[model samples]
Structure formats: structure tokens, C-alpha cells
Target: HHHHHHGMASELALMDTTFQAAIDTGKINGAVVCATDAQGHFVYNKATGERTLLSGEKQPQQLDDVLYLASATKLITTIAALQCVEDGLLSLDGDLSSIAPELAAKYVLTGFTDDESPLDDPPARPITLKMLLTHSSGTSYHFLDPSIAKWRAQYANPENEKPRLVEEMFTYPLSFQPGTGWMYGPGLDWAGRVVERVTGGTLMEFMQKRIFDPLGITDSQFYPVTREDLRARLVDLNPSDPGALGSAVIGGGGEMNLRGRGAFGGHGLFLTGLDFVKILRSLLANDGMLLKPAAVDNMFQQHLGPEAAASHRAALASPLGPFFRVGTDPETKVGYGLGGLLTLEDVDGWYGERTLTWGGGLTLTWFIDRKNNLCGVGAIQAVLPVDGDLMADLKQTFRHDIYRKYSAWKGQQ
Candidate 1:
């Protein structure tokens, strides 16, 4: 990826001064610094910035950025899948079964009602590639929603990749029919595998050669292998109770967490702040050396068409509907792109609409705010649900502080 060279780069020296004071006074475990230029080259917590608790066990390892990126993988997965669409290898409106027939087994959308035999109906229509990418495919996750858990519990089978178990998804019920709603789940994983099947290459190979190599993301980690010395950079996956790693899910939790080795298309990826920022920068700037400008432009085009939002028929239903829609600011006309939520420059907004942002399962956060030609990455292993409040507070305060600084830069420029 081409390194960013902002004609008049914003100076963050003052912000660093304040951040160091917080670290010295023990206000947080650690803080990350990140930025994107008009061209997308990264300036994340550059080499000299290192201040984590007792010397931040995993924070300083630039390579640690590769640690299980979780849902953040969706951001990248969506882009890659779209590239296939652009190449004529796949059609966005094409039925998902056109790609992965195994997922098409039952062709029905079902959901469990309290005390009722799971509600079943033939999906109003086939699941399209658009639905999978937009998460309107009627698939769902188990841990997040009560209904999915109830269904899984009723059909308990803990065996390895059991076809029978996987098949249970059909009888497992959906939040809504194929195109009528949105719910996040194994939809992306199915998309990932589809990419693998179509390209005749592993997902890792497609990513590395196509996206990773071009963007200079040297530390994005997929699992089952390692680089020895870098192992220490991984954070300890703590338990949920108070002082241990949470009870691991059969195929999705810790061993996948502590050591990063799984083929989870929807959630698994390990990335350092710098390496990740590089990937974002490349995309934000549409660096042609890697991806085509037309391709990148089309990927960000919002897919949640005219419908307001269909209720999630998946696990862990989002209180804000499943995925967000695309709308640019009228005053500035800055719009939300495909794949993520956006906060415009308005009284109710937090960040500018120009920002393209998303985060991983933990506290790892990243954003690309083109308004001021900026991008950033925040990496932390703060466990979820428990640290949710703490993370919320910091994210708001920090982003506000950074924007305040940028506002000044824009004026001077």
C-alpha cells in the first residue's frame, strides 16, 4: 500500500502528552493511537508509543495486532466477497445455494416460539448473495439469542462437525424469511467458504495475495500456525466468573482465543493496531495497486435498500435491527457505506459521517474518517459484556478528544 503523505499532517503531540499522563496515573490498562491519511498509509501508535499496565504484556507487540479480529473479519470478508461479484464469478442477487448447497438443505426458515414446536415455513424466497452479505439470510447465532439457545439445547449433539448437527440449522428456525429481515450469524462464514470454493484457493491465500500483501498488513493472523517468539504477545483469555477464561464454546471460544488457530470466517483473525490500520488505509484510499478503485467504490455502496430494517431472525438480536443502512449527511452529504454503522455530523451523532468504522469482539476499534483524511486503530483485550460499559465510556471520550484536535487542524489548513 502506498504510504500516506498528508500535505499538512495534523500534529498529535499534545494528545500524546495527555495520554501519557493518564497512563502514568493508572487510569487505563493502555491506550492506542491511530490515524489514516488521505492515502491510507498508517500512523498507528507508531514505534515509540508503548505504555500498558505493568508494561502492557500484549499491547506493545506490533505483531499482536493479528490476534483474533472476531467480527472485524466481516468487514474484510464482505470486501473480498464483493470482489468476486465484480469479477462475474458470483452475482450479488444469486441464491446462496448457487454457491454453498449444503446450507440450502432444508430451504425453510423456522423459529421457536415459547412452548411451541419450532415454527416452520418455507423461506419466502431463496437466500440471495445480497442477503448473505447484508445478513438478511435468516441465519442466526446461538449464544446471543434465547430462541436459538432453546433450539440448540433441544437438539444437543456435541460431536465434531456433525453433518446432522449442522443440518439442525434448518429445523433451527430464523428471525424472518430470507429477504424480509436482517440477522448476523454463520451467513458470513458461509460466504467465506463460498469465496474459498469459487477461487479454488484457501481464504487465507485469497486475502494474503489480494488484500494483505498489497496493504502491507504483515501481522494479520489466521490460526493453526505461529511465528514462535510472537506467542508472548497474545493476551490471556480470562474466564467469565471473575478470574478465569470464560467457559469455552466447543468450536468458537478460547483455544481459538489464547492461541488463534481456527477457520472462523465470520469472527476469527488476529491483528495488531498497525497492521490493521494498514489494511484500512489501503481500502479507505482505494489504493489501486491492490484493489481496483471501481471495485472498492462498489463495495462501500450500501446494500440495505429501501426497507427500514427487518427484525433479526438470528441469534443475539441487535437492539438496532441487524445491520445499519446507508445515508449520507445532507448538510455535508457524507454517507454511510456498506457493512458498518455511521454517525453523521449532526446533534445526535458521535463521530463524523465521513468515518468508516468497526471493531472486533473485544475492545479493538478502528475507523476511517475521510472528512479530515484520518484513520485509526485501538487494540485492547478487554473482555466483552463485562467490560462493555468501560469500553463505551472510553470510546466516546477518546473519539471526542481526537476530533476536537482534528477540528483545529482543519481550520488551520
Candidate 2:
């Protein structure tokens, strides 16, 4: 454990300005930023201009304020899957069909008919644990993949209108052959279910007893089953607009709406910025607090080989709009590890050489900079899937400031 005072007053001032700009410009209702390094952690929370320090001593706020982890929940699910691998309960190269046959039964979409109907065929390869962890399982989310969206419209009775059971995801076809390409989708959610089946316990149970408790994180859990006090602290990002707080689009529905989908392994966790950084801190140390040291190293390494990494880089170069995009970098190729995106190169000199980073749907971002021995977790409760342009710009400014200050801090030593 580490503690600190207002030593970085100038840096805090700059952070306050960046956070306040987002609130002032209507990009978000509230935001939280947590940055940790070898020295100490810095946490800043801005809720409609009411600034407070959730972790600092001067104006200490509740460190347990719950916020949506969104897709960031995939990190926990990925870690659980890796733990199973390390425990010999699962194998990276083993067929996923061994535990969850439903995922194995999915077909691959080769093309579409002249009438815009999907053309499907059996995959040449079976889905594997490696593929699922790396988002190369070929299982595409209805909301994220165009082909999957088309398939859902044709088969699943209109996307987002019907109450989609998590198991129903198995009915959809994969967009490509397993292990052939990369696309962010519901693969981890399926992986989470596989963990449940193999462990004979819910994902929540395994996570609590094994991962969260070991890390001393008491504030994170599957939504709707979380603490009442933490839930009350959840900020409504779109307080002014009707239906914005609980918008169903992109699955921004409130906790109650997601209650039925227990322990969504992919995006159902509510974690505070303080708690999530604990996981990041462990990664920075390769401390094996959750998984063994070798397992942790494998996480940050590129699981995708040269060929698959190339294809993944190409796909992200021309990403599907309104869903996800890595970045438009020709030289800096993108790679997928066991869980999150792996930077092949020093990304614009901001991200380190081997950083693992990911973000939630509603603008929560995190990264483990092993090269720099530091990690940062940020949150902004926005109504939209990502955020408005202004919000994105403001976020970039904030991230750049953090990196710039960090570079200077490193130089000081």
C-alpha cells in the first residue's frame, strides 16, 4: 500500500482543468481519473464541477463509489480464463467446444446473397481458448459487427428490440474462420460462461473467492447484486435528457435492466476507479497476485502470431465505424494478447513499448504500462456508446497531459 499528499500540486491543477472542461462543455456529467506509478496514486473526481479527492487526505471522498466497468470487465474475465489455464483446468490451444459446445457449433459467414442475406459455411478450424481470449474466435457481437448485425436482423427478430439472452449469442454465426481474423465481440462473455461451467460455480463466485478477494478489491461485482451505497454513487451521465440515463442502445440500460444477465463476464461489473487500478498495479509488478508470473507475462505479449497480427492490424486500419476503431497507424501495427490490445510500437510516444490497454463502452479507459512500470484508469459516465467528439478531444488532452507529466517525472529521477 502507498500514500501521498498534495506533492504534485501543478499536475493536480492541470488535471482539474481537463476534467472540468468535459463537464463544462457537456461532454459528460461526471468523470474520475486514477493514475498510479512506483511513487503513489493520484485520483481526481469531478461531478458536475463539485471536485473532490476520492483517495487524497485533504478532501477525501468515498473510495468505493461504484462505476460501470463496461467492456473493461473483459480484463477480469480474461484473467479468470488464464487462471484456469495456469491451473491446468483449461488450455490455450484446447478446443473451446470441450467445455462449451455451443460456441463450437457456430458457422462462419463467408458472404451474402444478392438479396443481402448472409452466406454461411462451417469453419475450417475449431474455436479455441486462445482465440476467445484474443477476440479471434470469430464470434461477432450483433451491435459491433456489421455481418452479425445483418444476421441478427434476419434471424434474431430485429437487433436490440428483442430481449436477447446471453446464450442466444451462440445462435449467431462467426464472421470468419476461428483464429483467422480479429474483431472485438462477445467471445469473452462466452469465455466467462465457460469458466462457470468448468468451475461448477458462477463467474461471480469464482471471481470473488479467487481474484477480487486476493487483490483486496471489495467494491467490484456483477451489477444489480452490488452494494447499495456504491450503487447510489453511480452518476447519471445524461441527467438532462430523457431516456439518456437508461438508454437501451449499446446496452447502456441501468443495473436493474441488466440484473437478469447475471455475471456477464464481458460487461456487467461495477467497479470503482480505485479498485480497478489494483488489478492494474498487480500487472505492473508481474506480481502473480492473481495469476502466476509467466501467466501475467503471456497476457501482455502478443498471442496472435505474425500472420494473424498483420490481419488484425489491417482490420483496425479500416475499422467498422460507430462501433470500434483502434487507430489509423500504418507503421504501428496492433496486436491482441490474452485480453486487451497490445501496442506493437511506442504509440505516438505516449503509450510505452509493451502496454496493455482497453476501455469500457461509456468512455472508461485503462492501461498497464509495463515498460514504464505504471498504470492509469479513467472514467466518464457518458450516455453514448463512446462519447461525443468534444468529449473525445478533451479526453485526448487529458491523456496527453498525464503522459507528458509522467515523462518529466521519469526524467527527474
lDDT of 1 by residue, 87-152 (tens): 788987877676677656544436656675577676777777777767667777765456676777
Q: Which candidate number has the best TM-score? A: 2
Model 2 lDDT per residue over 28-86, tens place: 54566777774464333333333222232122234455666778889989999988887
- The TM-scores, one per candidate, come to 0.74, 0.83
Candidate 1 yields a Cα-based lDDT of 0.53
Q: On a 0 to 100 scale, what is the lDDT of residue 334 in model 2?
A: 54
Q: How far is candidate 2 from the true structure (C-alpha RMSD, Å)?
A: 6.7
